[PDB]
Design a protein around this nucleic acid. Sequence first.
RNA 1: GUCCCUACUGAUGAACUCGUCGCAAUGGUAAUUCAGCUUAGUACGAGAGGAACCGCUGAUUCAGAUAAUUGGUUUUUGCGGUUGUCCGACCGGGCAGUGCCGCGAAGCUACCAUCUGCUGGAUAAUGGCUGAACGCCUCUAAGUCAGAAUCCAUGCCAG
RNA 2: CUGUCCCUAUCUACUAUCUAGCGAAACCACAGCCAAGGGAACGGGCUUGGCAAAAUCAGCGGGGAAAGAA
RNA 3: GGAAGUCGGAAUCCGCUAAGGACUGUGUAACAACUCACCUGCCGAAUGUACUAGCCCUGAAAAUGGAUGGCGCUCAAGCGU
Lengths: 62, 246, 440, 135, 62, 113, 356
Amino acid sequence: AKSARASRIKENHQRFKKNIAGPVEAARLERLSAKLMAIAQASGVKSGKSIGRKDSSIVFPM
Amino acid sequence: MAVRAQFENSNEVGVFATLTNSYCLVALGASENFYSVFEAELQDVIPICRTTIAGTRIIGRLTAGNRKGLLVPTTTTDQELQHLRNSLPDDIRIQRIEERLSALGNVIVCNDHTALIHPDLERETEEIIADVLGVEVFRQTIADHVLVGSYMALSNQGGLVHPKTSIQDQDELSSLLGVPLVAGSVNRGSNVIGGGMVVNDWLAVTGLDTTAPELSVIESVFRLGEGAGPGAINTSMKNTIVESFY
Amino acid sequence: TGWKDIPPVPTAQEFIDIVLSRTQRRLPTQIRPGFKISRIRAFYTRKVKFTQETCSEKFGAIISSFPVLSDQHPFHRDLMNILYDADHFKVALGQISTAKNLIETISRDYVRLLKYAQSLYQCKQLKRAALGRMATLIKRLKDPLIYLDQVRQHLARLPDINPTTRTLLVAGFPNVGKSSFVRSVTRADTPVEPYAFTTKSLFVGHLDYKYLRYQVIDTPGILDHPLEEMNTIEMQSVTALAHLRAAVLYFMDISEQCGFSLKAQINLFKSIKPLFANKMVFIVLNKMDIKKFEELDPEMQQEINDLTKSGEVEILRASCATQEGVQEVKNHVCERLLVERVSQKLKAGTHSNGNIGTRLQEVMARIHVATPMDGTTRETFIPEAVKNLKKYDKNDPNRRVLARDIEEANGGAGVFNVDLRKDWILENPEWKYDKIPEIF
Amino acid sequence: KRGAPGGKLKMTLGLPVGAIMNCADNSGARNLYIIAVKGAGARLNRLPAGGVGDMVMATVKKGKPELRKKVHPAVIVRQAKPWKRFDGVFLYFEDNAGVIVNPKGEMKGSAITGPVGKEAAELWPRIASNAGVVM
Amino acid sequence: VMAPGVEVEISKAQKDELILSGNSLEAVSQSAADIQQICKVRNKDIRKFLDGIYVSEKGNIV
Amino acid sequence: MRIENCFFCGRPAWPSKGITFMRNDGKAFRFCRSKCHKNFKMKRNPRKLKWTKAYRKNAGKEMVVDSTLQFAARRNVPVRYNRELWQKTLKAMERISEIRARRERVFYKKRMA
Amino acid sequence: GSLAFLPRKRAARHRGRVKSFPKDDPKKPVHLTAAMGYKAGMTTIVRDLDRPGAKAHKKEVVEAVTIIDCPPMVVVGLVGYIETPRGLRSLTTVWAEHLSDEVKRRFYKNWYKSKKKAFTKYAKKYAENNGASITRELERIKKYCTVVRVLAHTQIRKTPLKQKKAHLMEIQINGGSVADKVEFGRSLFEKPVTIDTIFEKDEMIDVIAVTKGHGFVGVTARWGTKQWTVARAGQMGYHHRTSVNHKIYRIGKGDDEANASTETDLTKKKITPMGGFVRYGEVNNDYVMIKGSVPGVKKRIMTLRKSLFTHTSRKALEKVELKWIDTSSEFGHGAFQTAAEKKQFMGTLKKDLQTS
RNA sequence: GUCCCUACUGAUGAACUCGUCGCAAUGGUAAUUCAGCUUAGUACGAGAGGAACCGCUGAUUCAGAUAAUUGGUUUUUGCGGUUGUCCGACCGGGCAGUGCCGCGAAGCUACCAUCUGCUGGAUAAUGGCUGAACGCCUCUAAGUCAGAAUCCAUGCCAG
RNA sequence: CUGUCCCUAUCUACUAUCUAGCGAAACCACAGCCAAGGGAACGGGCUUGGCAAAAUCAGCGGGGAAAGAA
RNA sequence: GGAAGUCGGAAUCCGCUAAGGACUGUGUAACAACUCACCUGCCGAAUGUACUAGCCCUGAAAAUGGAUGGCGCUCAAGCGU
Ligand SMILES: Nc1nc2c(ncn2[C@@H]2O[C@H](COP(=O)(O)OP(=O)(O)OP(=O)(O)O)[C@@H](O)[C@H]2O)c(=O)[nH]1
Ligand SMILES: [Zn+2]
């Protein structure tokens, strides 16, 4: 019998994933993301916009 | 019209089918090829119900009925019975019976005027069959085989009985019933006519292995295919049958 | 049923390569000189044996797969005898058998010598000798292997002709219309070309008449020659003409189209009538569309009538181009076969003692119809939609959608979801598709 | 063609190899001796077993001399070892019984004494035809 | 799926035939070979089953 | 799906709960648990064992004649689906349940007067 | 036995780690990957199957499901990761206001004697206008990170166990740009996330847990017997496992008061069995009822995550039509769904008469 | 007729302030086979017979889990019956190294019970494209396409 | 029915983790991680590679035992 | 039976010549047709047959993972002087 790692089996799996499971999970994720977004929305140095320095080795100690 | 089909790959159509002159019952499984052939041969003339009895696909061998009623065993569940009622019109009365012999399609044969049952049923079952089907019910054996529902087919135009019945036995059933009766085989020599055929007054469905001579026998016996089909053809044009089934 | 199940017969080189590869690869091939002498002996003895059983299995398969000419129906027996030179066939099989015996003897002798061997070199030489002696034997059996391969292919391609079945055997002279009639009557592909010996073998097709299955056998074509001096292909037809209970259809052409005189056809018939000893004999005159029967000299008309006034040989007329009477010839000849066969069956069943046979009782039981003594009929209610209904045809454009086409369009076989509530007849049709309360 | 039923669900196997079983049809045999089963997966040291609706290859111990000459295929119709049907209902029969069947799937007898297992009735159409009680 | 830059036409010049035109010879020929290889028969008789999609003519557009 | 009643004791035999036995006579014995199964296999009498509805109704510990008790029955001639019928059936179920409970209280008090 | 699960060492951590999140591509919408829960037990269901091709089609089949109590999960942190030649590296983390006593208990070991001084200076780092520092950390995540995760902890306070220590984990955000997911996490700080917002019904998921321990077990039960490939005696059980492909059949809201009700049995009842879940208690919160068995002991922490790959079976696309939910007592051979049913069945008793 | 060291399997561990949350070098690695429905009594075939890809569903072996249910186990010595003997009798109990018998929850188990077991690239045999050697030709020399349960990884286990 | 096998029952005998206290003997050149090579079917120390992290507990099914040759 | 060079047996000649075999293969039931040998036109300058001598591949291999000493080495860190 064809193994689970066969090239043909992988091709058929790819078509099934692209044609049916793809759209189904897309709509499912759309609904879940909508719900989660709904419940979630339910000077540079002194402002933080300019990212600065906070607070074994790679080079040889000179 | 006599046609040839198989359920999935099985030629025993009587196991999975049940025809009366007012409804058809078809087993549920996989594809709708069986449903398609049955509806093509019964094009909405009578209702057809895709059903299950006892969670099983042998509805033909588990059920029996006529144009005036339908009969199911006690193992039938209420959802299935509700399905049957909503699928069939009010002009057919459906009853479930608490009988020990649950193989109703194997123990009860029925035409829309008479009936013939296994000699080992109950009295209460006898009167309730006689009431629900509204037919005269008798107690006989065929070919010394107790399963008349399995080893014989019947209609209001004819009857096919076990190929190995004696002449006087055939005459006795003819006198009892009143319908012209001929003994013949189905599905290439099979003895289970009840399981290999399902026959209504205007339609027959046999298995695909049913040979042409025995299909001609079937048509001539039950006046199918309009034409003539008297059974007088069986008597007169006998060369075909004597050659084929010798 | 057939002879297509003959396994391929190798050539000598292929057989040698197969047997030696097999004993090389399926069996260990690594021994060392420092091992026990008993182990060395066992190793080489096992090698020689395994080779012997491989050869014996192959040769036995060859000998037992091919049919034995003794137990066939003499139709098939004579057909094989004329088509394969049964003498050469049997001597080839005998050479295979004696080679099998020689190989098994060589194996036994060399196993004994190996038993009494005393060194690894001796064992190796004894193995080499045994396996090479068996090879020389095969190289001797080069040619019979080729002959057996050829006959195997020809038998695998031979048609299935049932000796005892209701048969229409069409014979006659080259270019009378046998192949044309065969293609016009059945669906077997028999070549039709205007040259002499187009059909050079036996062809078979099948027919349906009164729900019985009939055989039809097209023969090559016989030529005015005393049987002893005929060709092989010609004898293929004569064996068919001889060992088949059938209706012989001898084709004569009223017109001189074929190339042989009407006197020549009349001659051949009178010559092979002993072949048509008791088979049902029908002469059919074809090519009426070019020369009708009435357009002849009354002298030949009267010779034909004199042939008619003899036995139960029957003259029919047909035309394998306009198909004017092919169906009529079919009907008449097949009906006569059917009635003759049922008659002989009834006679065979009717014993002298007067006791009806069991099979005859059974067929009478299957023929008898049982009817009520009173003779009263029973009323049935056929709905008028049945009589005013239109038959289903799968090629019609405006058919009805139908459940199988519905599932095919809306999915596949294990995909479509069947809606079981669509046929529910309720009071309010909106109440459909409702979860029915069940427990409380 | 091996008489292995198709689509059969997983069920508890209760009739092993080397089993004594009753005969449920009018074929004239009384008991059968299961010596092999069909469609089994050969694993080391396990004695194969079959449930109702499974073809086994068995020899008749006592019965009709004509039947007591050959080894015969047979499908078992009743199983005393409990098993569960997909409707969740666990169940078992009073004994262990089967019917002699030809390799094609046609029974030699004409009537089956006692009830018939639902799985066997589903799998073999002939048993559903010659069955008296189906549970 | 074809190599970039090849045009495919079902012409109404002959029945049941196809044209694969292009500018790169390697791409054109490799695409033709790919279609020929994908439509190939399995476990049948070559001498008996003659069906397929096969290259017929090779040349230049102008 | 149906709420079966145990053959031996009479408690509700829910699906996936228990074992059923098939006698050769052709009718099925459904038991709700291993207690009932083992008791029947030992062939004890449910009519005699005092933890069974059979014993309760034979010794007169539970009412056996009441219109509330004739409303309940297995139905052998099926009916067509009818939404208002089913809803009114639900409401009737509630009413009959409370009436049964209250009459059962009265029966118990009249017995243990 | 198996040469894959061969270091038969006990799991180093009782919680279990995801070890693989589904591959991220910005095209999908922004969402969280995993969640936690606590195992309660199993119950029995019957399902009107709709599976074309199976003999159980259009029939009722008895099926085994497991209950996982999942109270709302509080989001308290956001971790930003960078991609390096040595792998993924935690660039930096940002916590939130007012971490709860349960997550602080997770941080501490001897919580009773300790001075509960966790994240005090971090609360000051917010409240003292170092929002500049917190924003610079957020922009560092936006500008330098490629994988963003959310620190989330459960509510043992709602879960009915003697424990009081929460369970933190990092749940990866998928489907969007780094800026979008950072904004999502920052907006999600200090708000519980619900299991019906993380998963939904009929979604085949993956469960990660620690399978029950059995201690020192001989080869007969360790390997199923009659070099490192030879069966040896040692620790069997307490093993980290990730079991795949388990269809979530129902998400119960907990507050519906009819969690165990289906459309066919109009019985107002909850999932909690009559007498409570054995050795666990009552499921009074949102619950996930999942097909089949699940690794782990009752009341054990669970990790529920999405499948790493798109599904290849009709089993995942299937809709589930429940018929009834088992509520009978797991403490023995029960037969009554509700106390009202038991009272109506058995009538009144001596204690009832003496009390009334 | 001459209880110890080491390997393997697991379990602890000081030093780095304790703790939490992670990364992944390296090491192991896993799935296997059969059957049924549709294709289809179609292709093909004189006839008898009679496939395959796509789609669907199960089963065997192996592996990892699990206690809804079912079966087994009983020191729950939980409840009841009963033998000998004893505490004057009843009640309630003791002894017979768990007296024996029935049921027996919890727990543990059982393909005797149930659940799950996944996707990319590169290759061999081979089939090719373009094109020299060699003014024909050529799958090969330069370049290059596809292709086995093969190789290497992800998924998985250890860290 | 058995000059056959297995399981259940009984009896006989040997079968036992940690703490307190008491407390041997066998045996012991020194040791003890592997693979290839080390002509004398010889390796445990040598060559050159794999490598290689303190201190311990438990299990144990492997090695630390064998010829002498007509 | 059919066999026209090509299912078979034997010889294999002459003319025309530039050259063409009572024919090297494909093909037909036979033909027909194609093709080879050979010949002419175009092109234009070196070819092609057999051996010999270096180097390289194969010229036979089992079974714990390992060995030009190891790394590694390709107009060498290989080979000859
Ligand atoms: N005009 C006419 N010609 C016919 C008729 N039947 C056969 N032929 C001729 O027969 C020729 C072919 O020969 P076949 O029909 O095959 O005759 P055959 O007996 O099979 O012998 P073969 O020719 O060797 O096969 C055709 O070309 C037709 O012209 C007929 O009925 N009418
Ligand atoms: Zn009960």
